[PDB]
Structure of mRNA endoribonuclease toxin LS:
Amino acid sequence: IRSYKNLNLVRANIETESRQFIENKNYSIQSIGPMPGSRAGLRVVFTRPGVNLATVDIFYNGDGSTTIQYLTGANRSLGQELADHLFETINPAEFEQVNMVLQGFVETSVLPVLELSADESHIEFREHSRNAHTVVWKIISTSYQDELTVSLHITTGKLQIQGRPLSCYRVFTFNLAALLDLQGLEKVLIRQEDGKANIVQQEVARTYLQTVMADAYPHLHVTAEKLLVSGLCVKLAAPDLPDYCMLLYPELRTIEGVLKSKMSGLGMPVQQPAGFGTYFDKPAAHYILKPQFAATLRPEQINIISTAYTFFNVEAHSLFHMSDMARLMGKATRAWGIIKDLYI
Amino acid sequence: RSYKNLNLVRANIETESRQFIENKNYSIQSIGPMPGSRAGLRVVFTRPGVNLATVDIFYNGDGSTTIQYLTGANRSLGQELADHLFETINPAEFEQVNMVLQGFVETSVLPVLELSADESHIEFREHSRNAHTVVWKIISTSYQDELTVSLHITTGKLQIQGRPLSCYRVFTFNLAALLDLQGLEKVLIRQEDGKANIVQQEVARTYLQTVMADAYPHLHVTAEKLLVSGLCVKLAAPDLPDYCMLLYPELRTIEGVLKSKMSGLGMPVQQPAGFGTYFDKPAAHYILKPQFAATLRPEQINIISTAYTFFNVEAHSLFHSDMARLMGKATRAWGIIKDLYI
C-alpha cells in the first residue's frame, strides 16, 4: 500500500511534527532520541494506556532521503499511525521526478529566462559548470529543499531539465512558456515525452477561442494567438493526470502579455526591478490601485485592472507555492473573460 | 492523373463528347462502335491545322469504362476529351467504403434502413438471409448508387460496402444517432484508425456549453453525447478534403429538436406524413403553413422556419479552408439549436 523508504522530509521539522502528532493523539511518550550506533536518525518509542510499546526508527540515509521503520517493537499497528502521518506531511509533487530534453535552445535564450526566474523570492540561480559542449545551471529554493538542474548541450542546442517538479520547476517553466513551440509546451505542462496535442485540428481550437473572445479576438497579438490556441490544444489532448493545475499556464502568461502592456500604456510601466508592488496595495483579498492612479483613469478600467491583477499574482502564489478538469476549465473560462474585458 | 479504368455514365458518353467537341469548336471525323471484339466507342475528331485525334473507350465486362487516348496520331488533342470525361465523374466514385461496426442485430438495423428508404429516390431490398449472414441492398433511382449492408448476426458485425454516395450518406446520417464514439468516428471520417477516442471529453463539454449558454442544460442527454462526440471528431479529425459530414451531429440534433418542438406545438411529424405536409416553400426561405401561424407566436414561427430551412438545405446539399467553413456551419447550427429553446 505504501513504502516508507527514502522520503523527502524537511529534516529540521521531523521531530517537531512527530511530537505534535503524539500530543494531538493524547498519547504517552517512552523515549525520543538519536539512534544508537553510527547510523544517523531518530528513535521514537511511544505508547498509550491500554496497548504495548510502539517503536519507530527514522534512518537518515546519506542521500538526504529519510527512511522509516515502524515495523519494529511490540506495537506496529500503533507506530504505523506516526509513519503515515510523517509520510503525508510531504508535499505530493515531491514523489514524482522530471527529466526531459527540449531542442532548439542557446545560452543567449537561456540566461534571460534564468534571470527572469531569479527575480523571485526564495528562488535564486547559479552556474554549476561550463565546458566546451555543455553549461549547467542550478536553481535553489529556501522554503522547500528544492533544486533544479538546467543543462545546455550547446553543440546540439539541447536543454535538459532535471529534478522534481515543485515550486522551482513551476516558476522556470512558466517563464519559459513564451518561447516553447507547440510540442515543447505540451512536454513541459504534461511532463511526458509522447504527447498528443500536435494532432488536434488547430482550426477547431481557433474556432473555440474565437467563439469565446468575440470582439476582443482580432485585436490579439500573434504570440498570444499561437500561445492560447496551443494551450487549448493541450487542454483538449491532456492525458489523465492527478492534478491539472499547471494547464492554466497559457492563460496566465497571456495575462502578463496584456496586463503589463496596456498598463504601460496608461503612464505606469511595470519593469522587472520596479515590479507590480509600487502600483498596488493589498487590503483584504482583492488588490487595489494606489490613489495616485485613480485620477487619470476611468473607473471602469480601474475595476477591470484591479480584478485582473487580483486574479493574477494570487494564482501564481497558489500555483508556485504549496473532477480536477472541471476546476481547470472554470479557471480558464474566468481567465478568458478577464483577457476579453481588458480589451473592451 | 490516370485515365485508365474509369466509372463513366454510359448513356452520356457519346453526348458529353459531342457537346464538349462543339464547345471547343472542333470538327467531327467519326463516332461509332469499336471494330473488333472489344465493345466500346471509337471517336475520331480533329480541327483545322493538326492531325486526326483518336480516342478509344473500352466497355469492360464489369460496367467500368476505360479510356485510351494514348492511341492514334494526335494524343495531345485526345487528352482534352480524356480530361473532360475524367472530370465529369463525381469524385467519390473513385473512393470506396468498406467498414465493420460491432454490436448490431437485425431488429436494430432494419429501422435505420426503413428510415433511409423514407426518402424520395432511395430504396432498399433484402438480398439474402441464411443462418449466419443477412444481406441488404440500398439502391438509388436518381443516381446509380448501390450500398451493401451485411449483418453477421453470429458476431453482431455490420459490414458496410460500396461507394460513399447518396446512399451511404443517408444511411450513416440515420445511423449516427445509434453509433458509439468509435463508430461515429469511423463513418464520419471514413477510416479504420480514427483519432477521436483520445479527446478530453470534458473540454468538448466546456466548448458546447460555452456556445449554448442558457439553452445548454435544457438539452436531451442523448443529444449531449451526440454533440460532444461530433465536436470530438471535429477536434481530432485527420486531414480530409471535405468535412461536410462532420456536421451530421449538429444536423441530426436539429432534426431531433425540430420534430420535438413541432410535435410539442400540435403538429406531429410522422414517417409517412414526413416534413413535407407541414411547410411551404415560397422563394428560398421556407415558411410554416398558415393553419399553424395562429396558435403560435410569430417569433417561434420564424425560428422554426429558419431551423427547417437549415435542415432541408443542408441535407439536400449532402445527400446529392474547409475546416473554417465547417466550423462556421456548426456555429450557425448551434445558434439554431439554442434559438429553438427560447
Notes: Chain A has ten helices and eleven strands. The interface with chain B takes residues 196, 199-201, 203-205, 207-208, 211-212, 232, 235-238, 325-326, 329, 333 of chain A (CB under 8 Å). The first strand of chain A starts at residue 28 and ends at 34. The longest helix of chain A spans residues 299-320.
